[PDB]
Amino acid sequence: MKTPITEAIAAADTQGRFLSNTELQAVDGRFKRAVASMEAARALTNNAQSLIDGAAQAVYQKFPYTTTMQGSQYASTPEGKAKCARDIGYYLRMITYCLVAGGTGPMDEYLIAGLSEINSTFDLSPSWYIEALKYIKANHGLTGQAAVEANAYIDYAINALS
Amino acid sequence: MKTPITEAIAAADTQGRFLSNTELQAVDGRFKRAVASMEAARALTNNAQSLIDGAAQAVYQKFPYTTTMQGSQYASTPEGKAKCARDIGYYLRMITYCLVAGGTGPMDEYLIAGLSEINSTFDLSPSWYIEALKYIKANHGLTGQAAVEANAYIDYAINALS
Amino acid sequence: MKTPITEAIAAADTQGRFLSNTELQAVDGRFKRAVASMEAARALTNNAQSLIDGAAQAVYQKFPYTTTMQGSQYASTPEGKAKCARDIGYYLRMITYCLVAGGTGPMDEYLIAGLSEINSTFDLSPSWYIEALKYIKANHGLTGQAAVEANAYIDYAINALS
Amino acid sequence: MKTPITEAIAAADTQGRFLSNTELQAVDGRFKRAVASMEAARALTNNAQSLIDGAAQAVYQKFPYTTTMQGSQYASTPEGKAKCARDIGYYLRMITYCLVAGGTGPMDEYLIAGLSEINSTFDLSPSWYIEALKYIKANHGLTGQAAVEANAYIDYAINALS
Amino acid sequence: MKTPITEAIAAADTQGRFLSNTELQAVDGRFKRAVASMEAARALTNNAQSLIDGAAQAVYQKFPYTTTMQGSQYASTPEGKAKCARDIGYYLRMITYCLVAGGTGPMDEYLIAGLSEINSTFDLSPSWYIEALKYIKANHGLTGQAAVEANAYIDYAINALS
Amino acid sequence: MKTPITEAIAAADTQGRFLSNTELQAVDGRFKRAVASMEAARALTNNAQSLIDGAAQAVYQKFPYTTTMQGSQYASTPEGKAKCARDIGYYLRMITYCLVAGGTGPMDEYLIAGLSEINSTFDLSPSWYIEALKYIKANHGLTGQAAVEANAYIDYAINALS
Amino acid sequence: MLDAFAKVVAQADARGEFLTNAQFDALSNLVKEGNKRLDAVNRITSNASTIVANAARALFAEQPQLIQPGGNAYTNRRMAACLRDMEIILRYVTYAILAGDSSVLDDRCLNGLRETYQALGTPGSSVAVAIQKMKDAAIAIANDPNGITPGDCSALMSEIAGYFDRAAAAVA
Amino acid sequence: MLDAFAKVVAQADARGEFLTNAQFDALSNLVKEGNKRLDAVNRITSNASTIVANAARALFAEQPQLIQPGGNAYTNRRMAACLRDMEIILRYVTYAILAGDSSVLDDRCLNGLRETYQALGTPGSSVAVAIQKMKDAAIAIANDPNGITPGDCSALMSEIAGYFDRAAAAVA
Amino acid sequence: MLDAFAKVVAQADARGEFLTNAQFDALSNLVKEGNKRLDAVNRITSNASTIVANAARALFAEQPQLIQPGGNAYTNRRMAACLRDMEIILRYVTYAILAGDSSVLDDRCLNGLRETYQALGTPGSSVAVAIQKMKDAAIAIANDPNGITPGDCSALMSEIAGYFDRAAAAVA
Amino acid sequence: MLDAFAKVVAQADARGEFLTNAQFDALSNLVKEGNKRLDAVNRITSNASTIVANAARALFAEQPQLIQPGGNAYTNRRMAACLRDMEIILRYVTYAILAGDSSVLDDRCLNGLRETYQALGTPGSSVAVAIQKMKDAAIAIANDPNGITPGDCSALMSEIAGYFDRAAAAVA
Amino acid sequence: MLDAFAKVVAQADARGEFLTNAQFDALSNLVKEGNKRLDAVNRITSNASTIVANAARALFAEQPQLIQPGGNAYTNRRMAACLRDMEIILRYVTYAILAGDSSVLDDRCLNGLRETYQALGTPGSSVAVAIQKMKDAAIAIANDPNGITPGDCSALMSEIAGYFDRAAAAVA
Amino acid sequence: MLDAFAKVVAQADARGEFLTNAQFDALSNLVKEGNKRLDAVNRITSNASTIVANAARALFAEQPQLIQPGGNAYTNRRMAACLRDMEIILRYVTYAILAGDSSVLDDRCLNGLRETYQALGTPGSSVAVAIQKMKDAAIAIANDPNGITPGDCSALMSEIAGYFDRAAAAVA
């Protein structure tokens, strides 16, 4: 899994070398940035339910047809709505993992790999999730470097969907 | 050249990706550690001549035969002594470059690559330089993280010679 | 370009062999199936404008938001509508090329290669084109093997979008 | 084994794709050419003994020394004559297999692979078999496309021996 | 070209090493065996015309049809006879080159490479040349190690034709 | 193991060929050079103890500090002296093996492979062994080609240490 | 690989005999049934995506534990892998239909698959259920009486079911 | 590569237009002439070895300096190489006949061949003579009135000569 | 490659000298400006997709001949290639921003690109227009006063424009 | 591989849950102990050569049969191989110290090593003795009170010993 | 691999000793017998083709079921493979004769061959018969008193038979 | 490559003639001079390291600008490269001495070296000086009258100088 630490180790192991000061500085950067990351992770976790509930509705408002059109890919039934809220919770949970891990590894491994194939096979529109992520970015209520941290991964998800 | 920044970029370029938060944290670690590194670099540079003069003599004291034995590989002539002081100045200068660059790249590129071949071809004993480096480590007069920084590269050189 | 003939030649050239009876039978199959293919190609070409006009509207009817929602990716402006009709004409033209060539080569080279990247970059929904293609399949008015030929490539496009 | 069908499948499997119309036309060409091929196969099979007996003697007539010269590679003994008739029957049987299979696969796999090594190791002259094959081509008594089919494989054998 | 010397050098160059005693002994073996080789080369060269004339006739005697059968591949015309004597002279000349060079290199490069393709394309029987070579081996009139040297290359040719 | 024979075989096996005259001459060179090699091997073996004792002392005389300086890498203790005499006996024994084998294989396999790593890890100076080898070369008391043989491998060792 | 034609040839060669009249007659019939065979391949191929997608949705609705956190189909990477496998199996099954012989299926697909799924931790019996669902969808599409020249094309439908069951048994 | 069909398609695509009636009619005619085309390919292919061998013998009888010690075709290795080239050129020419377009010939064979022969020291003009001899043999075999359904198949013979001349000019 | 730090080191080594006070002071300032630099890289990177997409739409609206049948950006394969190139150039530009040196841009991206576009037939001047559009979008995003600690971060904006102009000149 | 952070994340994902307060608190503590961890890695790394060399000398002085003619460490090639292995094991142990998790050690180093030594004929129990000697040297160097800010850094020393014992048990 | 010389050296090294007089004397004798050894290798090598061909004909005349349709040597591809194997075994046997040691035979040829033949379905005992026939032909050729300096060269003939029997036992 | 023997053979083959008496006599003389040739190769090879080292020291003492910061031989990597080249040239020169022909030198070493040094920025004329120094050392070692059977071995010394001058001219 991609983290500042595993990247440090992989780079050293590829050259069959012992870790150097070059690698250890990187890790220190990771430990120091942790304060703001853990701050963003906890906050998103505490307000998870409301961010998810608010994010789901923002999508239904932006794309009104997702609630009326017939088809299992739509949130026009109780199941569809449950699937949609579940997916959005998946995105949010992934972002707290990235914050906690200090890298995109969790999101890359559990969500982004195979993302295009899934949205294509099940006819799920990327613009739906992008709107959910934009809602979370605008309403997480974080400031300073904690916001910079959260936004970094939110935008990473958005770009992966673009 | 190996630095925290070029390592960040190379890693991103190898995956054909844009720099991520993972890479940017590493660089921040590099910028924050710079204060202590620049401190060690300046100090070594200011006291360069005395460290070199003191280091050369410590070698002659540890290995008395290097001043009496005949052979161009020895410091038993004015030229040999000039060559030895030049070499020691090379090691020290390399260490200030590593401190300034934030990585072993300078030392790796200008000194360590081909090191064994040279000492073998010209019959120069590694234990001579190791003793010079031990002298510099004991007498650079640095404290705190500035000393930790200087020592890290000094020991990197020593291990390369071992 | 992938055709029954270039496939015959490539296969022979890869084994560095002269064409054999195995390859020549394949080509004869291609010449005999041509009658029905040319029949489907001409018919689609003659009725191109109405199939395109009818196909565009079927999409707007299936997905009403494509005509009202704001955004350059939608057909909610005169330009959007022109872009949509142009795209649909592209799909139809490609299908007549496949019929005429006797293979998917034209569609593979001019339309399917890079298809996912485009729909993703410009936020164009695959289900839009699938609906246009379903309209063309239901209204081309072909029968017998001529219909079997047209349908084969129409469904090839649909699967490429799925 | 090389047949119009296995070639169709291999080509599709190499591109990891589903069979396309391109491949299915080829197979239809194979099914339609079968009528003439099966016609040639049955006829050669029914007249196998006389074609073989006549072919063997044509060789002995063209190359009279094969019946008088001493050496196990020659048909100057009862065993040699039995070996020769057996070999010729092998060539004929292979040709009916190619006709039935719709490709050179049978001949390629059971006879042509290793052909040069065998004729070289056992000192068997290729011109002997070429003459046997020319006899079969001139006396199989087939007409139309049935003859075109038989001749195609007969000449394939001849070229393999050239 | 394959000789005891070029083999010595190639082996050393492949390991990027300087020639060793291992390689120099091999060359000395080559210089010492030269006396018998040069003896065989000169003798074959001096008696070239009669060996060739005698060898050609031995072939015509062993295979009487080569003088009566029609076909450009046969020696049934003045040109065919000239071609045959030329070919036999080629084999003999090659053998003196191998003796002089101390290895099969000359024969490998000028005659054996492409040998099967030629005899196959022009319908020339290997057993014809083998008989010519057997005649030369039986009538070169060499004894001792000079004969052992000549025979070694003669048999090398024969095996290449087998 | 590298010998004139294994080199002959390897070269033939790499080309998947039978041994040729080219290879057999090399081996004969090896058998003929054996007389002088076996002469040098026996002589060195008979005078092993004195050559080793004399060689060890020549080193202590050339490099007087090896007997006074503290450190396990030096011969300043009974153990160090035992280690040094053992090492020198190793070099001599290796040279008799090379003479007996007709190649550098024994020395390459048992001593030269990993040589630099060892002298570097245990801080053993190559110039120490070179001096021991120079003593052996000057005092083995061999003449003619027997001396040429011994010297060849002695110098091979020296160059490996340079 | 071998099609139904090379299958008979290889059997005859092993015995060193020309083909018998019965064998020639049997082969001519396969040729006469070629149109139906090509229709079945074209129809299944044309509906490849829906067959796989509908079977996947049905499987996950019946066996929800496969997509729950931890499940073998959880995460998009594993979900994609699972959809790829269903498509791959369907692909090799159509090859076998065209060839009229199952060797290409066994050889390049089924052989060693069970071992592959056990090493991964993938529930083979669930894969078998997915295969079975595609079977029923493929056959209903291939044997659909609409839009095609009427005729008995049922023996072929049994042959097709055979291949699907063959694959389902290799993973189960 | 492109056959005569993909050639028209690629021209139409570059202009963004459906095919015109004239174009459809032209394409249907190529299809109607397919039997003759397949006969020419089968006949030349069936006599591949003799065409090459007879042309080689004729070339060497006219230009004996090519096989004299030193000549570019002296030694079996060089002789084999020369025969291989004649066979290779004949091979690519038959591909072009089947495709009804010369791109496969130019692309995978002729392009860069002249430069190849100059670097080697191979006389291109002599290669051209060999090609010309194969041409006359190939055409006399393909257009032989014996054993085939009578009919005018001469326009195709001009097309075939064109390819040979095309190759002869690329090495000459 | 070289960052702004290894650049000074390599210059000093070539002269065989320790660093001077002026050089140490200059290097310390780069370090003090590191926060701004990281903000610019993060902001441009975070808006990578929109920057490329918006620039592509603008280019094609101004130069419609690039997407008309025949145009260099016609067909999805060529369109995809063109979008990939814009993303690639933007990627290497951000690398140069982080490194504070343009060598990584010249070395792994710009060097030999002009020749590449000429061989293909790609209009370099149109590529330059696309690059220029991304520049204006990247800079407006990086230097946006909203949501960040106030301060003069304009010298860096000139450095960033420099890299974009550098790439635009290499293809133009 | 996994560090101590990705370890918790992977456990949470498998259960499909956000992190709990206890987990967040545990993770924050690892971060607060980061300085000590980096000191231990830097100190062991800085003395890499002596640790390996001193352990090798000690091993061979206790087990002289390993360097006697025939012994597994006899000849420079085998001696070099043995020193390389000690350095390699030490290398992977420092990786595990930095990661705070032993997976990188097990995965890329320990896994399959025992089998490797048995196939070669290398005495695993002697390797274990070498590992143990490096352990005592590494820990005495890492936990040396001289030249560092005073503080309890003993829990980390137990973690470090754990990795060494882990490697010693995998070869023993 | 090892020849008879490196064999003694490797045994001495394992014990850490110089060679003894007995060993030097034994080695000098091998050298004195070198001429006979080279004659045997040259003679067998010179008759390589006939030895293999004659043994193949004899085998197939005694065991006709090997070339009957179905037999393991039926079809030219399998026949060629079988002739190649006989030549390969003969080749490695001559290597062993030259080396005076059988390691090159065991190592690069015999080792794992039995398993290879069982996997294929090749009758090892029939291979053994072919090997035995080559043995009798090789020895009668090598030890032929005609055209060579008279002398006892029989111990070498027993050594040669040993290698053949060694190979025959490895496949049988 | 070609030795002095294959050189004559290749010349004769190009003319299609057996060797003449003059040629046989010339070749026999090369054989009679073989001992001297082997002595020169063995002696130069035995002193390979000192020849290269002494020439390197002399070069750098005369041309100190080559090892001054910036110089082409500054830094251990470049110094090592320079020593490697001197050893490589010496190696190929000894090959040519053994072969009695310079083709192996020109072919695998000298050819394209000048271009290589210009691209790098390496002063070819300085390389030439190093080569010249090795020449004088190699010849004084090879032609040293001590410890060898007396005799005129001077023509060979001119041949050896020729190769060195040949290499010096190719880089100069």
Ligand SMILES: *[C@H](C)[C@H]1/C(=C/c2[nH]c(/C=C3N=C(/C=C4\NC(=O)C(CC)=C4C)C(C)=C\3CCC(=O)O)c(CCC(=O)O)c2C)NC(=O)[C@@H]1C
């Ligand atoms: C079985 C699945 C169903 C069925 C089949 C059926 N098909 C035909 C006839 C034809 N099918 C084709 C189709 C193709 N030929 C091809 O070469 C290709 C690949 C490019 C395809 C897809 C053709 C050409 C024919 C013949 C012409 C026609 O349409 O009739 C038949 C009739 C066979 C006959 O003539 O005796 C039948 C019965 N029919 C069903 O009801 C099943 C559901």
